[PDB]
Amino acid sequence: PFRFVELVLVVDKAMVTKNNGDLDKIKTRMYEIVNTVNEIYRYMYIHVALVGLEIWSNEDKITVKPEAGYTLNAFGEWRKTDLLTRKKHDNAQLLTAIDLDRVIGLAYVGSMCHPKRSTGIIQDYSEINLVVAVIMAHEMGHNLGINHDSGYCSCGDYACIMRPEISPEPSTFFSNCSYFECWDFIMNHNPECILNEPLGTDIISPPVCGNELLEVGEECDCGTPENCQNECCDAATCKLKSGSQCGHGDCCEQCKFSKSGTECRASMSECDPAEHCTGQSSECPADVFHKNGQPCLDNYGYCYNGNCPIMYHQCYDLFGADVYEAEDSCFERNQKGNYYGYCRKENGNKIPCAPEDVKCGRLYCKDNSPGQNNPCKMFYSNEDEHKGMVLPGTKCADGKVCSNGHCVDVATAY
Numbered sequence: 142p143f144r145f146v147e148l149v150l151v152v153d154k155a156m157v158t159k160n161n162g163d164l165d166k167i168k169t170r171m172y173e174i175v176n177t178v179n180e181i182y183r184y185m186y187i188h189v190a191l192v193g194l195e196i197w198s199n200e201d202k203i204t205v206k207p208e209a210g211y212t213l214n215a216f217g218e219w220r221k222t223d224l225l226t227r228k229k230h231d232n233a234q235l236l237t238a239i240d241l242d243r244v245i246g247l248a249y250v251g252s253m254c255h256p257k258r259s260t261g262i263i264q265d266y267s268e269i270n271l272v273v274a275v276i277m278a279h280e281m282g283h284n285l286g287i288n289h290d291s292g293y294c295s296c297g298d299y300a301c302i303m304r305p306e307i308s309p310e311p312s313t314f315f316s317n318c319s320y321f322e323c324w325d326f327i328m329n330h331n332p333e334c335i336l337n338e339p340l341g342t343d344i345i346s347p348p349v350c351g352n353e354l355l356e357v358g359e360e361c362d363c364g365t366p367e368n369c370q371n372e373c374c375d376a377a378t379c380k381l382k383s384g385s386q387c388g389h390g391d392c393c394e395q396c397k398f399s400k401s402g403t404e405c406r407a408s409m410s411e412c413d414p415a416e417h418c419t420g421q422s423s424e425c426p427a428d429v430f431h432k433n434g435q436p437c438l439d440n441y442g443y444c445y446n447g448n449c450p451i452m453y454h455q456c457y458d459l460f461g462a463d464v465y466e467a468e469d470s471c472f473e474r475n476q477k478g479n480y481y482g483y484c485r486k487e488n489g490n491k492i493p494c495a496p497e498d499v500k501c502g503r504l505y506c507k508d509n510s511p512g513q514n515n516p517c518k519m520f521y522s523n524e525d526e527h528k529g530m531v532l533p534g535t536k537c538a539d540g541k542v543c544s545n546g547h548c549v550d551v552a553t554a555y
């Protein structure tokens with residue numbers, strides 16, 4: 142029912158200096174602001190939990206400029222190439238003491254989970270936590286596909302989060318328009334990364350019994366006594382009550398452990414073993430995938446992150462029925478290094494495929510659907526040039542798979 146946003150916050154040098162190096166103080170503000178953001182989103186069926194906090198107390202890792210567009214793009218690039226590679230999380234917001242030009246916050250729209258664009262920047266505009274929490278909820282809202290309110294959009298007799306300007310007496314309410322646009326985005330784009338529920342040990346803020354997030358030291362958390370609908374839990378204490386072996390988890394049914402063997406996470410493919418309940422625990426074991434490189438689909442592919450990517454299926458997903466892998470000759474076009482025919486990008490440049498890597502650039506399919514005859518059909522859209530490119534891990538020859546635009550021996554690929 143609820144979606145979860147595992148948030149990482151970054152605090153710039155200017156803000157550290159502004160708080161005269163008091164990291165405990167900065168950390169406390171962050172915990173406070175996120176706690177309020179989580180409360181704001183309850184109405185949206187979304188939980189927000191702080192899973193990481195990076196404080197640039199020495200030097201900023203990007204150049205933080207007043208031009209918000211430059212700063213957000215630089216922060217997004219840094220998150221994609223640095224942070225995200227060493228820290229799993231769904232969204233990151235940069236807090237800065239710099240006075241950004243024209244705005245007090247900025248964020249990409251409908252980008253939740255995107256490696257670069259699931260970001261936003263927030264100006265430490267006020268010492269009042271509720272105020273910065275509103276800015277944060279607003280920027281994250283954009284990330285969740287929400288645009289500014291207007292017209293008949295209403296959130297009652299209060300100043301709504303998504304108004305284009307911040308109110309001097311800000312409320313914690315989202316308008317009805319925000320609610321529908323956010324869920325329209327989730328349902329039509331289904332950002333997969335916000336589906337999992339973070340483990341208590343993943344959350345770094347001090348535990349709060351009643352924030353609807355299961356944390357270290359709690360048996361259960363179902364919000365305030367008023368809101369709690371978990372018959373397995375005593376809201377005020379976050380302790381189990383009545384005939385309850387458990388009050389949370391995919392392996393907890395009616396407050397009791399699901400019997401051993403009960404499937405709790407379905408298999409995506411032969412490369413993804415299903416996980417089952419132990420019968421003595423309330424949680425589903427962590428998701429296990431078989432080793433990458435393992436032969437799959439009767440030797441037409443090799444495993445890659447729980448799936449078995451093969452050209453046939455990619456042609457099907459892109460073009461529908463009656464479309465198959467094209468003849469080898471079609472892939473030679475990947476040596477052109479033109480707008481669609483290349484193997485990868487370097488510093489934004491499109492790099493032609495070396496002859497041995499042609500099967501790992503743009504994918505070409507033979508189209509024999511009704512009334513069609515296109516032996517070398519490919520998919521190219523400048524909305525996202527990567528769509529249509531051969532998927533990483535795809536079998537490109539007997540004993541070979543694609544890895545970074547290169548067709549390499551599968552035995553040494555992983």
Ligand SMILES: *[C@@H]1O[C@H](CO)[C@@H](O[C@@H]2O[C@H](CO)[C@@H](O[C@@H]3O[C@H](CO)[C@@H](O[C@@H]4O[C@H](CO)[C@@H](O)[C@H](O)[C@H]4NC(C)=O)[C@H](O[C@H]4O[C@H](CO)[C@@H](O)[C@H](O)[C@@H]4O)[C@@H]3O)[C@H](O)[C@H]2NC(C)=O)[C@H](O)[C@H]1NC(C)=O
Nearest residue numbers: 290291292293294295296297298316317318319320321322
């Ligand atoms: C969020 O929640 C809020 C609740 O607070 C919702 O607000 C409501 O939005 C409705 C539109 O989605 C509004 O309805 C419109 O109201 C106007 C004004 O009353 C109507 O215009 C008048 O229509 C009558 C006859 O129906 C005419 O005699 C008048 O001449 C019209 N007045 C003028 C100057 O235009 C609207 O009707 C017109 O447009 C429709 C097409 O949409 C058409 O079919 C009609 O023939 C007519 O031309 C329309 O009914 C509500 O007024 C508004 N409520 C409040 C309290 O403001 C909001 O929709 C929610 N949004 C979301 C995203 O959920």
Ligand SMILES: CNC(=O)[C@H](Cc1c[nH]c2ccccc12)NC(=O)[C@@H](CC(=O)NO)CC(C)C
Nearest residue numbers: 243244245246247248276279280304305306307
């Ligand atoms: C004190 N500063 C403000 O309130 C200005 C006001 C404003 C209204 N229309 C504009 C068009 C361009 C630049 C600024 C404005 N707004 C902002 O900083 C908002 C920018 C925004 O929408 N970020 O996603 C974020 C804020 C609401 C939290």
Ligand SMILES: [Ca+2]
Nearest residue numbers: 147231334335
């Ligand atoms: Ca997540």
Ligand SMILES: [Ca+2]
Nearest residue numbers: 349350354362
């Ligand atoms: Ca809790």
Ligand SMILES: [Ca+2]
Nearest residue numbers: 413414428429
């Ligand atoms: Ca699994």
Ligand SMILES: [Zn+2]
Nearest residue numbers: 279283289305
């Ligand atoms: Zn905005």
